[PDB]
Amino acid sequence: QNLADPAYRRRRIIMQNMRDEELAIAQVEEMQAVSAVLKGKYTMTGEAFDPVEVDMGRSEENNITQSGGTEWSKRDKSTYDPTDDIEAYALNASGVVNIIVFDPKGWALFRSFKAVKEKLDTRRGSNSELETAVKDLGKAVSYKGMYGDVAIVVYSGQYVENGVKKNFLPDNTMVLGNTQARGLRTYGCIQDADAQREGINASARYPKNWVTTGDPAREFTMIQSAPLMLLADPDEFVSVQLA
Amino acid sequence: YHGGGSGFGGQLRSWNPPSESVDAALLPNFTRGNARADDLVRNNGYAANAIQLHQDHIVGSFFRLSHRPSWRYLGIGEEEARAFSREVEAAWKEFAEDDCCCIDVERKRTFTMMIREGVAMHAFNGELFVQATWDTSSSRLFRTQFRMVSPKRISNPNNTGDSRNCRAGVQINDSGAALGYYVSEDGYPGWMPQKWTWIPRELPGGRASFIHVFEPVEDGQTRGANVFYSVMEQMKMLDTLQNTQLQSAIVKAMYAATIESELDTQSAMDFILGANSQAAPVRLGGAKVPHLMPGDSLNLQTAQDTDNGYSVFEQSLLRYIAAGLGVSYEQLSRNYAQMSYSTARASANESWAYFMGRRKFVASRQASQMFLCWLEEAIVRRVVTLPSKARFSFQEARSAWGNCDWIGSGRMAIDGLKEVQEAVMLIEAGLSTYEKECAKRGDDYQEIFAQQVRETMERRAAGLKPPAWAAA
Amino acid sequence: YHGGGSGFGGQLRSWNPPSESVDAALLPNFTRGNARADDLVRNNGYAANAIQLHQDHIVGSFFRLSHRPSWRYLGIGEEEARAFSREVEAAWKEFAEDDCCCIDVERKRTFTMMIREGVAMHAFNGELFVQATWDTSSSRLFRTQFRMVSPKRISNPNNTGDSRNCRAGVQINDSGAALGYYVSEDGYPGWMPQKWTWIPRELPGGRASFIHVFEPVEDGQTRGANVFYSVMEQMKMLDTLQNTQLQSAIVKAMYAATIESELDTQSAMDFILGANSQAAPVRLGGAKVPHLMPGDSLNLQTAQDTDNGYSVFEQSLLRYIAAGLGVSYEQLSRNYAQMSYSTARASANESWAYFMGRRKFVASRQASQMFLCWLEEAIVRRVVTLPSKARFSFQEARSAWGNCDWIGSGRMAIDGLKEVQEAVMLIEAGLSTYEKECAKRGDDYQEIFAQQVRETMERRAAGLKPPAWAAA
Amino acid sequence: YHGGGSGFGGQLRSWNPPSESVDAALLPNFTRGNARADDLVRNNGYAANAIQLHQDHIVGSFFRLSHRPSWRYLGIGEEEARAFSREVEAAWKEFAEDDCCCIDVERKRTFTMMIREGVAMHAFNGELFVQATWDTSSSRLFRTQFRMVSPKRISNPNNTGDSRNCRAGVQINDSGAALGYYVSEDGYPGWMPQKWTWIPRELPGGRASFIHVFEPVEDGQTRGANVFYSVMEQMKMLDTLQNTQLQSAIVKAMYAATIESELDTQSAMDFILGANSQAAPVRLGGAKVPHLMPGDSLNLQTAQDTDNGYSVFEQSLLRYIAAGLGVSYEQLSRNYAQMSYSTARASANESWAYFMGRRKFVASRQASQMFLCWLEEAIVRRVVTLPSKARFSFQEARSAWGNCDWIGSGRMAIDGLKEVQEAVMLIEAGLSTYEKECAKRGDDYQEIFAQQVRETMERRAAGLKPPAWAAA
Amino acid sequence: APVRLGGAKVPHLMPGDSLNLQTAQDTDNGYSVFEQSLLRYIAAGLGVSYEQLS
């Protein structure tokens, strides 16, 4: 019923394209942002893009990865204090630490310890308050209560490369860090003669469209951003594999 | 009731419209409607004429202020109220009609021009927006400057879909009220606007930051609908009819003859039309009587009447269109067929009621909100001094302090003498005062009295006889 | 709403005009639009009449100055304000209306001529430009000289593609305001290519150095749109129709008769039409009766009606064009069909509303800015002296010192007696002053009073009767 | 905007006019346009009638001077100014009304004739030239003389092209103002080649030597364009249509019969027409009844209506032409359909506005410049004397000393009594004065007062009743 | 297949083809007068005058 002239249909189709372009650019920005934190460096590559490799010097003493010794899975789930290692890992950071980010598998591994359970129900031995029970099951982020001083965060975001969905954080990593860490959000200069004729430069998401008068007609649409995500102090975080 | 059935003999079995609110019937095709309305306004003789009639008769050439604060309610005293009103009117007159045109940000218009543009925007768009902003770096006396916004600019951010609270870029709270508007920036080189900026309707201090004026039709109507929607189809179809008729008349009147013969077409025109081969031109001097052999034959085509009744149909369609738009058929079509005085006066009255309604609502509301937004800063910067012994401060009762009535241009009567006679006869009796009659001519009676008082002494200085109004 | 849908039966399926702002709808075809407007004005009977009506009714033959400074806002005193007004009016009347025509550098116009040119340019181009400059070589009292800049001159430099801040040769700052105008030199035959120069809108001292007048349609309109876009197509098509019809009438009336025979081409004309072989010319003296054989024949052609309904359809098109432009049909077409007094007065009112609007806006703004630009030299050059104890200096409130209202030419009434009776009866009552009544006839009332006060003395000296206005 | 686009259905795909100023559109084809307009003025009745209307209504039968120097600025005094004005008016009235026609070198005109010719030559050519020289050998009171130069003479020397500083025979300085003019020689015979001279516009003292009067349209315009360019084509085509229709009517009405037979040409006319053999003339007496054998026949040929709708088409074209020229339709075509008083008065006033504008600009400016050129001599040769204690010398301010107002012939009202009644009604009230009323009849109130003061004495001495205006 | 309404067109017909511009009757051939008669009848029946009814 209802229905519309072949022109309404063109306006609707034209929009959802704008939405998809914005979502793709936002995904690229977030992927750069996350990859800049987990490890010191991240590489930008493509099929038509000459590879460029941004590298911020992070000391080898960071990026702590568990090994045949000092791993949480193999060790007993009763009679063990996770809190002791956390302090040892966080000693390596420069500056205070005020937040912890868990991949949900890592969070399930961490809260399974009985000692951390004991730290919750002590009358005077701590001020930590968590929410061990289920809190969020559809949302991407779940701000759990402060554990001691630092806050506890579980992030399960999804970026889709090809048809298949993928998770951002790589399968139970834990990232110590500071909630006020100095991060830079740098946007370069767009390279389009039409844009520069218009007078615009160093802007994010310059949109345009044009008609190509081809055999089937056609008018396209294009967003171009040129993003670059930096970290002023790369060694303010401490990435842990936590296997 | 046969209205809601199938019809007389099943003729209305297809006409089954859905019952929808104004929002669901207007918003999905809002932009196309606005675009078509603007297209008609720009490129039609009748649409531009209708807009010009709106602007010239609703508002006119000058749009003046009369400040009347409610003295009894505020409990301040009559004479102090009059003095305050005089100071405020002087200040506004100084600020309203600045020749440098600094009242608007773009420095292209004066006040009454802004009112005229507001009326026009309310004509073919259904709504008008004025934004009141400050210039901190400005070193003149009054910082407040107003900026016009076309309704094309206020739309959703980043091409989002219409939601319960945000419709067509206008945010709506739980009730029907509005909180703020999303305004883009239309830039000429290229299209597909880039960024959207949020600006609220009211500052936390109660000051007006965004002015939205329109008349609703139903319960919940986020944005208005222009007046052209009743006659958008008929005007386009009439334009097509006129252009096609003109082209057809040109083509039918273009072929004046037809030559039938057997010889070569050059010699056929040489021996019949009268040309020379020294196709080919034919000189238009004198008269000619060609000589024809039996095979030859000459035809002088005759065409149809150039206006075979198009002029009568056009009259009917213009009557329909003028009924839709609001202006009388006589003003819209410039016809003015021979008629009596009674019919002319009746048509003028029936248009006048509509024009006065429009002026009393749209232009008056816009002007009053502008005046109040200026008056808040005027009081704050102490260019004027409020009366003391005030029950309510300025913030508590804003409309009681800035209650103003505007006087626009007066009607031009068909008869010059009759209107003067009737005004004089009302003056002789107690039916009407001086203010009503001097307002019907676009005049503030206080200024007239001051001019008369100056002139009587001017005359007495030169030795002329005192005027009639002079007291003995 | 069916306005924004497919339409009646899908007839409007292809009518999808793009929703674009005025800047993106005017500028891409600017020069061609202005050129077509000029071509229509330069080669049509009706367009030149419309321009002449605009010039003659908006302004007329004299455009007088009436200076009324705002003394209360400044606080100087009534007598000092009047002394200053009289002095400045005398100085301006000397400077404006010189017969040496040295107000503009080309020495070809007076002041009223310049106002009329401004109105005309605002008619068929949509915008007017005036450049105010100085001449240090001139030894006269006042060094101010003005100029008229054709809108074609001001364009983007070297035809470089358009930009964001610099649109169509007019520079725009971050807000909507304009700062400078790129204007080129114009030499028609050749020389070095056009050199585009910079001319700032206003000098550092606040003086106005470049003038641009046009009424906007939307929020942002960098350059104006002419009045002809509504009806440019129809006037061209009417021109084509009229020329084609006239040529067709000539062609149809040219071929008077027709001869069919079987003899030689000249013998048949010798024996039938009566020409002489002593084509073959025929003498028009007297009557003739040929002699024919069975083979021959003579036919007297009959042509269609020369004017078969073309007049009525031209009437319809002129009504449309008159609605589009603004002038009433009776003025544009010179028809003046049998109409009563009521219809004529109503049509005159319809024309006069628009003419008053244009006079109040276009010519008035140009004249006010010109007068202020001149008054700055005067005040500075001590040709006139400011009143004492001024609350503000001249540069602080320019509008305060130069607050002026201009008098144009009045209306020529359809019936002369009735308007005079109306004015007299209004004067007898208190509704209107002498200043307004004498202003509606284009007279300055102070000059009139001086005239009567001198005429009474002249009559007394010569021995005649005292006049009616004299005081016993 | 559809005006600047392709058009309705692509019909305006080829309407692409050049964008060029008045110079690039006028100078290449100046002489051809002037020659065609002169052809139309010389060889068409209607255009000559329009020119006569221009001459008679713009100027009339007299062009009187009224000298009103601005005495207030000069600081000289009212009484000295009045005496100076009287003296200079008397001197001008005696100089320019010489029965021997010695104002102009050619001794063929008077002042009023010269002003009328200036107006006419403005009308059909677009400019008027007046050259001011001296005849040193002459022994008269004034040695100033003026020669009228036709615009055709001003041309580039040696018929070369237009250089940057010399357009169309007029020198142009760095600004648009003119500096000097190139004048050819009057060559009546084709042979005797022409000599080109050089005439500076102003003598080094500032006195006017060569006068150029014309109204510009755009910024830079070396020479103007005449009023006929709007309707050059239509008048020629109308003339061709008229001549062709008249010739066709004569041809169609010539052949009153046609003879069919099989006998000799002589005998067939003998037996049927009734001619005599002693082709064959026939005498018209009586009514004749021929006798026809079976083979013969006689056809009385029939023609169409002679005037089938030609008059209404002539009406439409004449309305168009009149609208182009500026004269009212009834003044141009002498039609005068049955019309009420209101319509006639409306038409007369609509033409009168234009006529008053033309008189105020063209004739007034030319006469003022000529009068200033004469007043320099009067002052220098001490024929008249300047008021003593003058602030400025004459040369420092020519306009102030020579400021003058001219009065033409007054209009002839449609109704005789109503104009007089309104004049008396105005004079009785204060809305006007004696000078303005006496000026509307083309009279000077001072002369009327002198005549009345003479008449009252003449009546009193002779024994008659004193006049109405006489004082007891 | 839908035509485009813009323009003035002159078709080129082969000998077989043809084009017919139908002429219809007066869309109001005397209906107003019959309405007048019937409305006068109805007004006489109901009591209100003809002007006040029609």
PDB file of C-alpha atoms in Angstrom, chain C residues 366-441:
ATOM      1  CA  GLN C 366      20.678  55.269  -1.611  1.00  0.00           C
ATOM      2  CA  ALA C 367      19.926  58.931  -0.884  1.00  0.00           C
ATOM      3  CA  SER C 368      20.466  58.545   2.867  1.00  0.00           C
ATOM      4  CA  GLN C 369      23.858  56.887   2.439  1.00  0.00           C
ATOM      5  CA  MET C 370      24.954  59.473  -0.146  1.00  0.00           C
ATOM      6  CA  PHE C 371      23.868  62.339   2.105  1.00  0.00           C
ATOM      7  CA  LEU C 372      25.708  60.938   5.120  1.00  0.00           C
ATOM      8  CA  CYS C 373      28.889  60.429   3.100  1.00  0.00           C
ATOM      9  CA  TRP C 374      28.714  64.081   2.036  1.00  0.00           C
ATOM     10  CA  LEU C 375      27.804  65.378   5.498  1.00  0.00           C
ATOM     11  CA  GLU C 376      31.030  63.975   6.835  1.00  0.00           C
ATOM     12  CA  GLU C 377      33.107  66.186   4.664  1.00  0.00           C
ATOM     13  CA  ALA C 378      31.075  69.147   5.551  1.00  0.00           C
ATOM     14  CA  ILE C 379      31.194  68.722   9.191  1.00  0.00           C
ATOM     15  CA  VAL C 380      34.938  68.037   9.003  1.00  0.00           C
ATOM     16  CA  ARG C 381      35.790  70.850   6.570  1.00  0.00           C
ATOM     17  CA  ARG C 382      34.090  73.400   8.881  1.00  0.00           C
ATOM     18  CA  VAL C 383      31.748  74.470   6.084  1.00  0.00           C
ATOM     19  CA  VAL C 384      29.074  74.061   8.778  1.00  0.00           C
ATOM     20  CA  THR C 385      29.449  74.112  12.560  1.00  0.00           C
ATOM     21  CA  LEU C 386      27.975  71.615  15.004  1.00  0.00           C
ATOM     22  CA  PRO C 387      25.807  72.786  17.919  1.00  0.00           C
ATOM     23  CA  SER C 388      27.405  73.139  21.332  1.00  0.00           C
ATOM     24  CA  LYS C 389      27.089  70.849  24.372  1.00  0.00           C
ATOM     25  CA  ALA C 390      26.660  67.696  22.289  1.00  0.00           C
ATOM     26  CA  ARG C 391      26.283  64.418  24.174  1.00  0.00           C
ATOM     27  CA  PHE C 392      27.873  62.499  21.273  1.00  0.00           C
ATOM     28  CA  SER C 393      30.298  63.478  18.530  1.00  0.00           C
ATOM     29  CA  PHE C 394      29.516  62.984  14.846  1.00  0.00           C
ATOM     30  CA  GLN C 395      31.327  59.671  14.367  1.00  0.00           C
ATOM     31  CA  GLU C 396      29.713  58.158  17.471  1.00  0.00           C
ATOM     32  CA  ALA C 397      26.140  58.373  16.108  1.00  0.00           C
ATOM     33  CA  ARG C 398      26.134  59.113  12.380  1.00  0.00           C
ATOM     34  CA  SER C 399      22.415  58.395  12.036  1.00  0.00           C
ATOM     35  CA  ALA C 400      21.606  60.911  14.776  1.00  0.00           C
ATOM     36  CA  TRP C 401      22.993  63.876  12.844  1.00  0.00           C
ATOM     37  CA  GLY C 402      21.820  62.798   9.394  1.00  0.00           C
ATOM     38  CA  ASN C 403      18.322  61.580  10.231  1.00  0.00           C
ATOM     39  CA  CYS C 404      16.448  62.717   7.135  1.00  0.00           C
ATOM     40  CA  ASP C 405      13.276  61.987   5.190  1.00  0.00           C
ATOM     41  CA  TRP C 406      12.974  62.785   1.491  1.00  0.00           C
ATOM     42  CA  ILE C 407      10.053  64.165  -0.519  1.00  0.00           C
ATOM     43  CA  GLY C 408       9.313  62.864  -4.000  1.00  0.00           C
ATOM     44  CA  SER C 409       6.702  63.808  -6.549  1.00  0.00           C
ATOM     45  CA  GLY C 410       3.071  63.362  -5.538  1.00  0.00           C
ATOM     46  CA  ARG C 411       0.184  61.625  -7.250  1.00  0.00           C
ATOM     47  CA  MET C 412      -1.834  63.264 -10.027  1.00  0.00           C
ATOM     48  CA  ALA C 413      -5.407  62.618  -8.947  1.00  0.00           C
ATOM     49  CA  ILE C 414      -8.051  61.234 -11.287  1.00  0.00           C
ATOM     50  CA  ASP C 415     -10.424  64.004 -10.159  1.00  0.00           C
ATOM     51  CA  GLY C 416      -8.672  67.190  -9.096  1.00  0.00           C
ATOM     52  CA  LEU C 417     -11.472  68.748  -7.053  1.00  0.00           C
ATOM     53  CA  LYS C 418     -12.185  65.775  -4.795  1.00  0.00           C
ATOM     54  CA  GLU C 419      -8.686  65.415  -3.341  1.00  0.00           C
ATOM     55  CA  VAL C 420      -8.552  69.147  -2.613  1.00  0.00           C
ATOM     56  CA  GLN C 421     -11.906  68.921  -0.822  1.00  0.00           C
ATOM     57  CA  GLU C 422     -10.630  65.928   1.156  1.00  0.00           C
ATOM     58  CA  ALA C 423      -7.491  67.808   2.178  1.00  0.00           C
ATOM     59  CA  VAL C 424      -9.466  70.902   3.183  1.00  0.00           C
ATOM     60  CA  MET C 425     -11.928  68.941   5.313  1.00  0.00           C
ATOM     61  CA  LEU C 426      -9.103  67.031   6.994  1.00  0.00           C
ATOM     62  CA  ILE C 427      -7.340  70.333   7.707  1.00  0.00           C
ATOM     63  CA  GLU C 428     -10.508  71.803   9.232  1.00  0.00           C
ATOM     64  CA  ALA C 429     -10.603  68.944  11.729  1.00  0.00           C
ATOM     65  CA  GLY C 430      -7.605  67.955  13.828  1.00  0.00           C
ATOM     66  CA  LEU C 431      -6.830  64.642  12.133  1.00  0.00           C
ATOM     67  CA  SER C 432      -3.984  65.862   9.903  1.00  0.00           C
ATOM     68  CA  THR C 433      -1.375  68.611   9.901  1.00  0.00           C
ATOM     69  CA  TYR C 434      -0.349  71.142   7.277  1.00  0.00           C
ATOM     70  CA  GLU C 435       3.035  69.440   6.909  1.00  0.00           C
ATOM     71  CA  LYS C 436       1.508  66.171   5.692  1.00  0.00           C
ATOM     72  CA  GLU C 437      -1.023  67.857   3.401  1.00  0.00           C
ATOM     73  CA  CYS C 438       1.651  70.064   1.828  1.00  0.00           C
ATOM     74  CA  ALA C 439       4.004  67.072   1.632  1.00  0.00           C
ATOM     75  CA  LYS C 440       1.507  64.943  -0.310  1.00  0.00           C
ATOM     76  CA  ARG C 441       1.710  67.591  -3.048  1.00  0.00           C
TER      77      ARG C 441
END
